[PDB]
Scaffold this active site. Structure first.
Site, PDB file in Angstrom:
ATOM      1  CG  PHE A  37      -1.578   1.078   1.738  1.00  0.00           C
ATOM      2  CD1 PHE A  37      -1.377   2.412   1.347  1.00  0.00           C
ATOM      3  CD2 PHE A  37      -2.039   0.814   3.021  1.00  0.00           C
ATOM      4  CE1 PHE A  37      -1.585   3.434   2.227  1.00  0.00           C
ATOM      5  CE2 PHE A  37      -2.269   1.835   3.898  1.00  0.00           C
ATOM      6  CZ  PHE A  37      -2.047   3.147   3.502  1.00  0.00           C
ATOM      7  CG  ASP A 154      -9.814  -6.105   5.966  1.00  0.00           C
ATOM      8  OD1 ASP A 154      -9.807  -7.067   6.782  1.00  0.00           O
ATOM      9  OD2 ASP A 154      -8.839  -5.336   5.855  1.00  0.00           O
TER      10      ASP A 154
HETATM   11  C1  AWR Z   1      -6.962  10.100   9.789  1.00  0.00           C
HETATM   12  O1  AWR Z   1      -8.060  10.063   8.870  1.00  0.00           O
HETATM   13  C2  AWR Z   1      -8.049   9.130   7.858  1.00  0.00           C
HETATM   14  C3  AWR Z   1      -8.901   9.406   6.801  1.00  0.00           C
HETATM   15  C4  AWR Z   1      -8.988   8.532   5.726  1.00  0.00           C
HETATM   16  C5  AWR Z   1      -8.204   7.372   5.721  1.00  0.00           C
HETATM   17  C6  AWR Z   1      -8.054   6.283   4.796  1.00  0.00           C
HETATM   18  C7  AWR Z   1      -8.625   5.981   3.568  1.00  0.00           C
HETATM   19  C8  AWR Z   1      -8.228   4.805   2.948  1.00  0.00           C
HETATM   20  N1  AWR Z   1      -7.334   3.931   3.453  1.00  0.00           N
HETATM   21  C9  AWR Z   1      -6.766   4.200   4.629  1.00  0.00           C
HETATM   22  C10 AWR Z   1      -5.797   3.150   5.085  1.00  0.00           C
HETATM   23  F1  AWR Z   1      -6.187   2.576   6.192  1.00  0.00           F
HETATM   24  F2  AWR Z   1      -4.609   3.643   5.301  1.00  0.00           F
HETATM   25  F3  AWR Z   1      -5.647   2.196   4.173  1.00  0.00           F
HETATM   26  C11 AWR Z   1      -7.109   5.397   5.360  1.00  0.00           C
HETATM   27  N2  AWR Z   1      -6.689   5.914   6.585  1.00  0.00           N
HETATM   28  C12 AWR Z   1      -5.698   5.356   7.504  1.00  0.00           C
HETATM   29  C13 AWR Z   1      -6.305   4.788   8.774  1.00  0.00           C
HETATM   30  C14 AWR Z   1      -5.513   5.107  10.044  1.00  0.00           C
HETATM   31  C15 AWR Z   1      -4.691   3.952  10.550  1.00  0.00           C
HETATM   32  N3  AWR Z   1      -3.612   3.549   9.600  1.00  0.00           N
HETATM   33  C16 AWR Z   1      -7.348   7.109   6.805  1.00  0.00           C
HETATM   34  C17 AWR Z   1      -7.253   7.978   7.885  1.00  0.00           C
END
Ligand code: AWR
Length: 345
Positions: A37, A154
């Site tokens: 990722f 998931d």
């Molecule tokens: C802090 O606010 C946010 C807002 C949107 C997202 C988001 C969107 C898609 N995918 C992720 C991730 F989890 F990293 F894959 C996201 N993540 C990461 C989740 C936090 C823990 N790794 C986001 C965090």
């Protein structure tokens, strides 16, 4: 030896630098997330005058193509008019920056796993569990709208975030693992603890697998502890069986992976495989006792609290057992879940 001129590490991630300004617009504050990722950063948008979360995808074909699936699904959700889409994290725009695909999301707060950590895994109130349950049922209803038919694949506390740390509003994140209803491609899906029996058994699946995950989640939010914490697939199925008994014969008769966990006796009935005595007998670890319906909640820790009556606990139990139906054709669906007595004011 450098990668991507300055800019990448030996692992295709953009080397994040605090204070860096991109495209004369985005001021990078800090790294807030990591995965496979790539990375997620907190950043300030000077133009729009708001904080955003930016998902910086690795500079590597495999992950780029995965993120483009995510982009396509979000943009598809975006063109629908309804208010139910607010329970999904909103993609604002995307762009290429120094050979990395960047997805710009609204900035959110901590996830529901972090929330449990702050309780020392003792769980949140039933009133709060209800608020989360209602919003998630609404999100699943939206994903179920025919023209989308999206399966998240998931759901777990990690992937449900609070909008604001002092409020109960939540959203689902990360559609990189997702797919739409159709012809089976993927088979090893869902995080183990939240993985549905149809997936464990190697059977056909649909949007109902997300409702199973939700069932497991809502119990875990109130107890603080995962409902089915399997070390491997055999252990996972055994822990499911401890609570819900042997799954029906008509299902196991069609499961390709039936014999990974079970054996068919000469009379046609199914049992567990004998594999040091370890598990509790089939269906004896009653959900009734796990929630503590008549015994003051999980561990007796809600004895004397308001909004934790026996009547309230029975409605929760009932809704959960409908989400944990072994049969995906009769497992409760989002529209009917929202009508359950657990949500009547
Ligand atoms: C802090 O606010 C946010 C807002 C949107 C997202 C988001 C969107 C898609 N995918 C992720 C991730 F989890 F990293 F894959 C996201 N993540 C990461 C989740 C936090 C823990 N790794 C986001 C965090």
């Amino acid at each position: 030896k450098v990668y991507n001129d300055g800019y990448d590490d030996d692992n295709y991630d953009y080397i994040v630098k605090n204070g860096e300004k991109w495209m004369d617009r985005y001021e990078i504050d800090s790294l807030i997330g990591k995965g496979s990722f790539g990375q997620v950063v907190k950043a300030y948008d000077r133009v729009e005058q708001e904080w955003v979360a930016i998902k910086i995808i690795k500079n590597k074909k495999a992950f780029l193509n995965q993120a483009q699936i995510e982009v396509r699904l979000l943009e598809l959700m975006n063109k629908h008019d309804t208010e139910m889409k607010y329970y999904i994290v909103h993609l604002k725009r995307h762009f290429m920056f120094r050979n990395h695909l960047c997805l710009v999301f609204e900035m959110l707060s901590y996830n529901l796993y972090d929330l449990l950590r702050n309780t020392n895994f003792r769980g949140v109130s039933l009133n709060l569990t209800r608020k989360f349950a209602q919003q998630m049922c609404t999100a699943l209803l939206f994903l179920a709208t025919p023209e989308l038919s999206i399966i998240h694949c998931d759901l777990k506390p990690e992937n449900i975030l609070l909008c604001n740390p002092k409020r109960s509003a939540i959203k689902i994140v990360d559609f990189g693992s997702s797919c739409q209803l159709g012809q089976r491609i993927y088979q090893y899906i869902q995080s183990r603890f939240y993985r549905s029996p149809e997936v464990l058994l190697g059977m056909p699946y649909d949007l109902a697998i997300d409702m199973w995950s939700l069932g497991c989640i809502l119990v875990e939010m109130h107890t603080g502890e995962p409902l089915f914490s399997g070390a491997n697939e055999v252990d996972q199925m055994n822990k499911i069986v401890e609570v819900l008994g042997i799954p029906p014969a008509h299902i196991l008769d069609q499961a390709p992976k039936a014999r990974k966990f079970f054996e068919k006796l000469p009379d046609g009935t199914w049992n567990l495989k004998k594999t040091k005595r370890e598990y509790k007998p089939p269906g004896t670890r009653k959900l009734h006792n796990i929630l503590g319906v008549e015994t003051g909640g999980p561990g007796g820790r809600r004895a004397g609290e308001s909004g934790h009556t026996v009547a309230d606990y029975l409605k929760f139990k009932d809704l959960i057992l409908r989400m944990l139906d072994y049969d995906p054709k009769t497992r409760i669906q989002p529209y009917y879940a929202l009508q359950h007595s657990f949500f009547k004011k």
